Amino acid sequence: PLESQYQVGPLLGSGGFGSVYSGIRVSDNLPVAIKHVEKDRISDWGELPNGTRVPMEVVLLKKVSSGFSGVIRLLDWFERPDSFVLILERPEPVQDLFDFITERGALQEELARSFFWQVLEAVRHCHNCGVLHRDIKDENILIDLNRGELKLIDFGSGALLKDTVYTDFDGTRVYSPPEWIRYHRYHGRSAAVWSLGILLYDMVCGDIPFEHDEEIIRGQVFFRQRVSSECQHLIRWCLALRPSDRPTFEEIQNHPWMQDVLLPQETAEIHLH
Numbered sequence: 001p002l003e004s005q006y007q008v009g010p011l012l013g014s015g016g017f018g019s020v021y022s023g024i025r026v027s028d029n030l031p032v033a034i035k036h037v038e039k040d041r042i043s044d045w046g047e048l049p050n051g052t053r054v055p056m057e058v059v060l061l062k063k064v065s066s067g068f069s070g071v072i073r074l075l076d077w078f079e080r081p082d083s084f085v086l087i088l089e090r091p092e093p094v095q096d097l098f099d100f101i102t103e104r105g106a107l108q109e110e111l112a113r114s115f116f117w118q119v120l121e122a123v124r125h126c127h128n129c130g131v132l133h134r135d136i137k138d139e140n141i142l143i144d145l146n147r148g149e150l151k152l153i154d155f156g157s158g159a160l161l162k163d164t165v166y167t168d169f170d171g172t173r174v175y176s177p178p179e180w181i182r183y184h185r186y187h188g189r190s191a192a193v194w195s196l197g198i199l200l201y202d203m204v205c206g207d208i209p210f211e212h213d214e215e216i217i218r219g220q221v222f223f224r225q226r227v228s229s230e231c232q233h234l235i236r237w238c239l240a241l242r243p244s245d246r247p248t249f250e251e252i253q254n255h256p257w258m259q260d261v262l263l264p265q266e267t268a269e270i271h272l273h
């Protein structure tokens, strides 16, 4: 009954993830996003408790969707002969962080601190639920403009979190760590911290630090606008070439730069309204 349960609105975007449309749940007028993924384009499959074979994203979103978190919720899913359709939460009004940075430029540090903090909390939640995102980036963060609340999207490159080495990767290369580039090997948490360093740089500078593999491997960061000494230190720590030299999530959240974070509502009042 997909076609009767949802009224389809405009296409929001398309890309490697599939095609995502604005929609409304007709029963209660709930705003949703409707994500279509072609079966031929799914490399990574999971299985539900009842035996049903599904995209990994469905498995991972179910693992994280219990209680509140900074993760966009899976509301329902449908199988068609050549595709899966996922029904996702849709804040309104909303803008992805890539579009936000593109429009507004480099973020003020107070704003970046609030956003970065919320991303860390959401990533911690995923990890606590046994899920590794593997594609943390501005394009995969939604901002609820009224509430100042950030939500993670697109678990299509994700995996079950494990303590042994990953030798597969299908996330975004420019957010991928040097050990992936050089050895095609990474561990989950330390690779996540690398991507968070890329993200933080992106927030405070308005662009990502590395384009080419050679730049990633060299790992040297330069600043084109004024960024505080403490923020620069945190970025450079997250981007340590050796995975063991990177901070843990606890170390990031205890860093001097991360102190005195604004709550989401205050963040929206100051920066978004």
Ligand SMILES: Nc1cc2c(cc1Cl)N(CCC[C@@H]1CCCNC1)c1ccncc1O2
Residues within 6 Å of the ligand: 012, 013, 014, 017, 020, 032, 033, 035, 072, 088, 089, 090, 091, 094, 096, 099, 142, 153, 154, 155
């Ligand atoms: N609610 C919701 C839920 C979403 C997504 C968007 C919204 Cl609004 N998207 C993003 C679609 C592309 C964006 C749209 C805006 C313009 N810039 C490009 C997803 C992309 C991939 N996997 C899950 C997604 O889930």
